[model samples]
Target: QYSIEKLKKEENSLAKDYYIYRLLEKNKISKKDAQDLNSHIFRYIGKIKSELEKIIPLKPYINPKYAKCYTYTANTILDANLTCQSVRLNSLVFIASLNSKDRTTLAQTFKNQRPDLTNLLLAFNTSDPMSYIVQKEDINGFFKLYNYSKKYDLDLNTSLVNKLPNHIGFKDFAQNIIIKKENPKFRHSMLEINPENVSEDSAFYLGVNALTYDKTELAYDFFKKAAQSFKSQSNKDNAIFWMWLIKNNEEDLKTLSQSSSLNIYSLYAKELTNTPFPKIESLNPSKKKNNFNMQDPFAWQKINKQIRDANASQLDVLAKEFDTQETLPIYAYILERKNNFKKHYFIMPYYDNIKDYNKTRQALILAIARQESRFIPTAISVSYALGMMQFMPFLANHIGEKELKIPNFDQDFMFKPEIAYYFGNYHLNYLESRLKSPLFVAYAYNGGIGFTNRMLARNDMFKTGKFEPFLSMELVPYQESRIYGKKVLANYIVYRHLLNDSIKISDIFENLIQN
Candidate 1:
């Protein structure tokens, strides 16, 4: 202690050993052994270990130094068994906890050998806290995750091949390397890819393209591929229903009809006694005239007035019971909100009969119109569901030709009260024949008759009598559709009780149904 030069030299060497020991201890090396490395290193080593434990429950295996630290920590604690398995398991959990560069290192290491570990890492790569743990370079992890997904009988390679951004390595990773080398048939190759890789939009487009090219079998295959890969039940049902439609095979239809995912198929089967494909020309939107006006607005106003005049007595009772104002504007607003206008003037004579069923029909119309277009007559949804009622264009054309004698009409005709009402009524009549309840029919209107038909056959909800609107809605698989059903019902009730000064929303449903 008296010799300064000798003491300084000893201090420098001890400091070096202390830093090394601190790094090791940061990864959880025990105290006795760290102290044995160099006496002065003990305090710093203990402090680092305590700090690191708060950040990461397990030791990280990132660098050679980190791995060495892990190795030493493992050897120090569980001396009898210091295998890579033990090191890797701890490292796997640690890697799963890291962020940015730390996570990237863990992901790459996991990808190199242990695919099971890779999948677990990938499972946590969602929009959660673990998402921060994944890096941009974690594309390697995605590939590994896709590769390991095979254990679950999912086709990761072909399914996920196109899921990545086109420039991303994953898009071609499976295509060029896996599919090209394996050269399996389309269906079998698709089965080898990650199901999560396939986007529903891509699958739908592929199905459409296949159908457009007259490759019905190929279209069916693509549709089935999409259905199997869908993350949501509604999307899966839509894909499978389209597949059945393309195949037009009774056996396939029967199989889908029994599937709980596509309950509407049974309803479609019951209603469609003949093959239901419309003439191919109807699908060609470009070939049809985009005519905006087919009926006079004055005629629409006159017809509505005539119906209202006939129902004046009933309207008075409804207004008084609901404590609503007895004004033309109020009634008009209610009609507008409810979307209860007729389709065409030729059907104006039918208003006499419609007046008797106005309240019930008004409720149904409001629900469809609100969900389909939010009461905007010219609205068009991304799926090409159009007009106030949001009929699929091809379906609109078919209905137009059969009911309205307007084969040349486009979705713009939906704004014309006469055309809209006629076709809407005709479609509703068709749906009613198949779906037992207004709710089921409403669900079918948004999703598709094919989907509704299959669901009806499988769930037996109609026969079983366990129909909870939201819980038992078999056909509405899409989030939008599910939300839409609830909103439409709510809007209908609001419109029905518009005349009342003081009204509980439930009262509208009770009084309307009771009448």
Candidate 2:
């Protein structure tokens, strides 16, 4: 019989100890001491659980099914080290354990669950040369699975499809099986293959291949067939996007606009082509009135003095807080950018903890922070990512609740200090893991994991003699991504030298460029 007072006292004590241990762990305080502290904290958790069990008997009060799910989730968190593989694998197991009804419900409830697991399972079945069982079924499922898998870097051997199942009418099956063969001869032969007799899957494969291989006329025919096979709105949206890319028309644009599943790039391209630019006269009236004022020498002096005085006062406050000599310079730089020197001074204290890293690296991170949210905590991206870190709401929710001990956060809370710091550090850690090249990681951070994975896959293919690396801008699919990667790296180097006296921008750039 545990009393409420007794439980509260123990819980509060345990919470304090947990936080103390966490702070020690973060600052890299003695490893043995940190472990000992964590172990003690765990013991307190056990005590609290025991007290809770006494208050409300687990067997009678809690549903067994829900309890098992909670147990599974807890064990996964306890066992999982902080890594992407651990995160993904635990989620896969959790999903696979559910019954079909529960799984479907879970899928709908957690809409952001990565589709990669299903595709990976398909790839696993299709890729096993010795496994003859999959060959007896339809291959359309396998191809659809492969397409989803490719989004996450789980590439399947396309050549092995003849040894797999034979299902038709599903997306990507025909293009993968008939058009995009590993063998060049088979792929070329697919061009002449009859579209009428081909399965819907085969038509998709042929159309995609023809588009990729420079046979626009043949691609159009295949795309038409592939589009006709889909009754689903989403499937039709995908087909229409490809069709518009081939034909370039207004009717396709109207169809795409109506479909919620339409690709953003296709929509943007159509809008840009059709919309007219505003005239110069419409933009210049206000500027014209200010031109005479700009010519007054004393007017500029007065403005400069006011700005400088405001900036100085702000820097004085930050200098006292951070106790760093470089605070003034950094504040001045920010002031120049915003043309509001006083407002810039207030942000100088944020750079205090940042000084531990080299100036160049710190500058890059600052630039990223600026580009991401312009230091606004409440910023939101078009993709529905939130916070200063710009974390996708679904991914943030998953990682935050499970890994970072932040359970009650919403997308808007991304701007909150704890959530922002946790996500920012997590993203940096992830980038460091994948590319082992900060430049590539920074690019991936901006462009996304899917784009980076595709780039790496293409690079690998080029190395293997499967494809030659194209050396022109035309070969780079996303211009924004390319520019983002380069700009961040360059600006980071510039700001690093400006902020820290001990570090050279050239040295940092040289090290980053080496690998």
Candidate 3:
């Protein structure tokens, strides 16, 4: 019974859903659990899905947890009259997922009830005549909801404008404004804006813009504001790190070096202060009786659930349990929870296989693997990125067939650490052929070569500017890629140091444009 309860806690997957279905047939699982399990598996779309839905008819009201699934089984939306709150919460998903005619139907249905959302729906699906009317009526609402690329023309609010969240593609607009210096209202807003009231991301972005234009004093002030205002410890530490970079103040540097957050900045601070690096420890693999398929994605999910739910004592036991090279990521994860960045979680497993490459090439592989999955060969991201190097299935297939010349390569083959590394090396070689720098390679690896190319073509990056690489690094449009590149670089430095190739982080940063 306890085992069944633990099984229920496992995240839904096709295999798991099928297992649940069999359990339901045997009267071993509850109907309520079946309903929850059916949510994610609708994307599979088959007779089993029909059986699941028929067993428990989906209600009119969309469960926010399964709104995305509703997009797959769209008839659910058309037949059921949705609640205002339901529509409000899942508006973005509907707008993004539903067709134009369906979107128009939704807009007409909710015209008077929720004009704000109705306008948003109509505006994006501009095939309808009502789109222009909605945009004209509530331009601010359009601005509020219009989150895809491309900038808006003319703004109404000054203080409110800067407070716009970074997620909504507003940082680019703000950066452009700071660069062009054409908007007086924006200038005035920044002048009068109280640091405490502004969003921390906005403050950080403002600081980046200031530095871009070589206004160090203003940049320092904005970073200081961001450091104070930022709620996330990482962002706060990043702000302080930026301030230290500008001023070279020991106090700020010390703060960063001692920061509990284990990020690129904290690692950099440690190196700069000549502080001892995190100690990398080894664990002995324990003998345990358990079913864990290294190739099956669901297996990893189940283990992750167990890890997340594990007690301190449980984690200690699980640490030794998953101490094998294949399960090193789980061990590292447990170590991270047990001790933060004080001890290095980066483990170099499968080193013998990669030792054939040059020291730099070997370090690069280890660094990327460490950052991508912490050496988890079976790691699966939320977006379905698979294996240690976290390759998208499609890209992995492409590289597997075209580059590696593997005949009839199965996707599950990536679950092998050696295979994942082989694929990574091939992909990295292609990326490095065009982009010679490790920093650029990191960007290409995470954000794709297309994004890296577009960024480099801008003529603003990797040049002899005020901050050069650091400034450009901070200003990378995609926040994930920006931070990802930094973390990978730091990892690369540590791995390189471990490889007896002790290179300065500053030297790497400075040489970003040289290659």
Candidate 4:
């Protein structure tokens, strides 16, 4: 139990801010006290002040919460110099409440700094959504424009459609534009006139959109162009796979099979063309040098720093130095930097520990472990998912302490292969039970069960179509989850094969939604 004064006096940190807000939400603190405490917190914390600002009450002249609508005179709106990102958001909401002339004038100030908001406010001000729909990249800007367009029954002309980038966030807008175009010939030529500066991202989306309309030739052209522009070999392989699917060209298939990267598309090409899979090789490390303390956070941090600063040659030396069971992930990461993909760094550790589990589950654990951390016990993600299995602290605590009722379970325990492998199996088992397909389970694992559920509910997803599950996989809306699922599935296929139960990537794709 913490007093409001005690919390306020405590060091300024995320935990203190959370507890303060918790008390306020629980009605343990008076509104006046809450306001003061929030201001104090905001004053000290630079990054999280926006969160603190949300709880402050709106008065004659009060702090702005970005989404909340507040009454303000035109002069007050003008006088509010929103220099920061959060403050600018609040200004957008404030300016939206004003009448057309005033709103238009206020929005001009936001032009260079926030073109997205500028376009959004102008659309709301003039009831003309063309600019916002075509230029706005922010999802929030699109949401506002969408509702306003709906209210006014505004139709997108060909010019607006031409200007629209084929962004996933603007999928509905682009689809609506194409639906209204209604001419097959005109739709076929849509990508032909795309802006010269149009990105590979937009090009890929245009390719998929073309496929949706049964325009394979147009889809192929866009994909070919995207392959040229994409930076990643994996992305290039994906586009080439689509091209081969459209044209069934031997050249495209050859290029995919010979690709350097070990992604799903290249693997598919290998399977199709009867190319031999890359052989895995191991590095022999001295047994006396195997005493690296993988569980020590500080030791891992030092190694992490060295890896960060390691050049191509330095990486080679570090790779040899860290070639132990516990630190093999570090070695693998270093080898990855040196572009050494075909190696035994993906080997299964703690196999005897998980002997009680079925082979399928054992394979799944290996698959996820490879993708999540390259079997690094001390791996930590920017989002704070820790260890080889990469479980977020909250999820780890829930599984270890709450659900499994493990005695004296700690997050540090996750740094051990035995512990992470067990937790990974438990969590993956839960996800696999809900989503029968490994691909969908990977999506649920990376994104969440709710995200996967939402994905399945869409009519455009996983159903029998011209280019079904493949298309849905490419355009899954959640970008990170989309790629993460593909990578994890590729890993799963490889691991399953290695574990003596082979599964085709094609089979997984075909029966993803069904399973």
Candidate 5:
């Protein structure tokens, strides 16, 4: 303000003053200087506010309204958009650059101001029941913005339950307190699923949820439909497997024995039949377009660019017209932009050529790109992950500023394969060190590190310090990520073969066989 106030009449600095003033007004630039504003700076700096916030961590918290009001204040100040308070209990990620002390300090100081955000933060901070951040643990914190009703408001007990391996002893003391137990308003009852209307994955979940609640008849009915709809033999077999689980139907096992099945569920199906899943029979060699594959791998690069720039209908035509024996994957690649990736899973031409990073697993990188976008460099998800790797824009932004030190980089950098792959590998490498279990790595890749850790801390055999991939698959909370972990693990096997390692996909199937 002082610098601009002294400007000459011709160059009077009203514009500069307003910019700085507006920032200060909004608290983005506090203390009349840019550095003095938001906690983003200090949140990462050396600090720890791990002082105790013990208030007998309440269920149906006894605090009055004021303690809760300030939480919204902090959420706004932090810029985490809260759409609905259903399940996102703050992936309250502890940034790697900062220690747990920083998270605790921010939570403490922010709560001292609002006292309500303190409630919400503590409410969701299941870092192990509000323990100080100085230990091998963390927990829920104090402060709430609004008091939830008996039925209307949300609570952690049900909303955030990870019930795949969800059985007895699921809740921690953090979730022991019941606030507002959610009663899901069912639109359709008795596992009402039409396989044609929903993705088979949805049908599988529909059937599985019924199974979770012990509605066997309802579960089998949906699984029966799921079995019919799934074109992927592995999925078809699982639906069959679930039906067999209900009543040991010889016919279900009979169907499994006939098809060339390779999915993990297929192996279980074979066991029910008292037959072995043939090692070589499971490979879908038809997916191999390698016989008349592209003579020039870059042949489709220009076509990809063209189709990416094309309109929807024109894009459709290009996908249909670009068909020949050799460019099949490219045609599939084009369809991927419109999300027809059911067929685009065969592309692997330039993945091996993308040598921009440390010796990150080529197979793993190829697998992620395949899963992320079916290798469509111009792909964009509904939640807006960009590029072939389908990176959330802010994620790539974090990588740019923190990992690569590039500031405010255009998210369009995600549109480039090498850039996306390099960053994608960078993240995978980070996940590699942490979730050393391959299935767990996939978990962290999809869910997040904190979530994965939270999951591992549960009371099942997982807590006994054993890393069982197959059991862990069932332990994962989200359906999308559960399926993602399975499919990517499968893809890595395919990539291994493509990279001249004759690995059996059924061998990968063993990880999910059973306890």
Candidate 6:
């Protein structure tokens, strides 16, 4: 909400301004009405935003009782099997476990719940990713189940004090994937890693996840160590890719070109290594696997009932309960139900009325909007993830050009909702072919195909979670990815309900997603 206020202060709010302009262009609402509504739209958005805020406060509302929002937190966590008691406890412990700027806010929020642990978490704060990773994962026994977890911590091997040729203009160290501190505690933790347990693959992966151009360093202890520790040719290729990303092993682009597995991640390498690789992400030339039919009456009513029960606080309640595999699509329905949005802003019509919103199915594409921007066309996050579909420039370029034939694009291209949807639609569609599920594609979209591939290549995927099509969503290494994957799935179910008008709560929630 504060961010909205910041955006409102813009003399030339490109996002808000363009949104109103687009609304007028669509002829959904008259220019006068759009201008009239434009001023209120910001406030209206904040209100709609407050709906979810009431359910589960954003980071700014830090230090509240996790148990007070018991159901809400679990809903966002989207882990059905996670007990409220355990999650609340874990959330506090985890929140308290860091010494970053968030350390104090989170600790105080839960002070009454677990003051000691809250403070205890403050003590665990470190400038080192290795230290933080060990505390967050090893000590807590998290990421053990998630396949790619142990391989590496996604922290950059960089220092704020260090000068580098790749440094961006006055980039803040806090913005980097990892930071360094002078704490003895952090130093002690990094030393805990032993020679016998260190895996080259894990170290290389940490570097891979942490790699961002400029103001971030790939010249870390582990990356250098992994260069020597690598045994497999595939590992060698990947390590070289990381080194290549940092512009060192620039010649190794071809070395990382193709993996024997010959899939999405491998293809991604091909794309990068190919110096503007394949024009398209291969879409199931072999076969399309069985896609679970979420479109049914049971799933629809299940979401609708929750909406009906919560009437006024419909979205608020939905934010928690709806944070599941079958719930995201319902967001558009909620927007449509409200009818409060001006025709100009409600892009759902393009999605709902047409089966051909993009090259992919309409519902999934719309569902991506729910997860990405909540239908805000000019939405840009703190991370420069902008427009409706949150395309970073690289992805926007690749998917936009390959799928949409958009060339010489700029960040502003993402602000155009219609065009933005195409890039998101294209990427998710390609991922669906590679990963075999919209659900997994969602994971790939939020996290990366590399992480998703790590999961698919594993045998434990279907054998874990008690629900049908059991997945290790709970154990997904990145909290964002886990939460995102589930939210995306829930959106899937919601669309299924919207389209199918079907399913009971337990029947849909508990039932495995069978392909």
Best by TM-score: 4
What is the lDDT of every predicted structure here? 0.45, 0.46, 0.70, 0.69, 0.51, 0.46
lDDT of 5 by residue, 202-247 (tens): 5566665565456777777767877887787777876887787677
Work out the TM-score per prediction: 0.34, 0.32, 0.70, 0.72, 0.47, 0.35
Shift of residue 445 alpha carbon in model 3, Å: 1.0
Alpha-carbon runs more than 4 Å astray in model 6: 1-347, 352-354, 357-360, 402-404, 464-471, 501-515
Candidate 6 residue lDDT tens string, 1-515 = 12333434444333443333333334434333433344533333433334433433456544454444445442243342334433554543344333365555554655686554454445445444334543333322222211222223343222311221122321221112222222223222333233234446545433433332221253344455565688755455545545554565545556556444222223435555543322211111122222222333223434455555655576665544433333333444454444343211123523533455532356567667777876555555534467667886567766666656766765567766556666666676688778666667788888889987876665645343322242244335565786576566645544544555322323433333433
Tens digits of per-residue lDDT, candidate 1, 1-515, equal: 11222222443232233334334534544444344333333233444445444543444438773454455432233232334433544443444454444344444566767654554554554543223222333444445443533222223344243444333444343333331223233224343333334445455445544443356676677678787777765456556667666666666665554443312333243234443311111111122222222233223333334445645565554333322221222233334323333210000111332344456565566556655654334443434355557676678877777657775765557655445556676788788787645555666777777866765565422343221221233224454554455455544443343312223433322321211
Give the candidate number with the greatest lDDT.
Answer: 3
lDDT of 4 by residue, 1-515 (tens): 46888777655543455445446545677656756664545234432343445555344454565433233354455554464332544444454566787667756877887776667677766545534554443446655555454433333345544554544545454444453434344345455535343446566667877887787887888788888898878888999999999999999999999988778899999999999875654544454346678665446656766777877788888877777755556666777666644443456765776777888888788888888887767776645577888887779989999998989987657778888988888898899888888888888888889978987887767877767778888767677888898988888877777777887777877786542
> Model 3 Cα displacement at 211 (Å)?
2.9
Ordering by TM-score: 4, 3, 5, 6, 1, 2
Instruction: Tell me which of candidates 1 and 2 scores higher on lDDT.
Output: 2
How far in Å is the alpha carbon of 11 misplaced in model 1? Answer: 76
Q: Among all windows of ten consecutive residues in candidate 1, which has the lowest summed lDDT? A: 277-286
* Candidate 1 accuracy as lDDT: 0.45
lDDT of 3 by residue, 1-515 (tens): 22345656666754355444445545665576665565545244654555666667766686676565445334456665365334443545556566778778877877887776676667667643223533355534644544432233433354454344423555555665654444545443454344454568777877876675567887788899999988877789889988998999999999999886666678778888897765556555564334455666677767777878877888888877776655656777878876644566667776677888888988888889888888777776645577888897779888888767798896667778888988888888899899888889999999899989988887776766756677778768777898889888878887887888877776787677633
**For model 3, the run of ten residues with the poorest summed lDDT:** 147-156
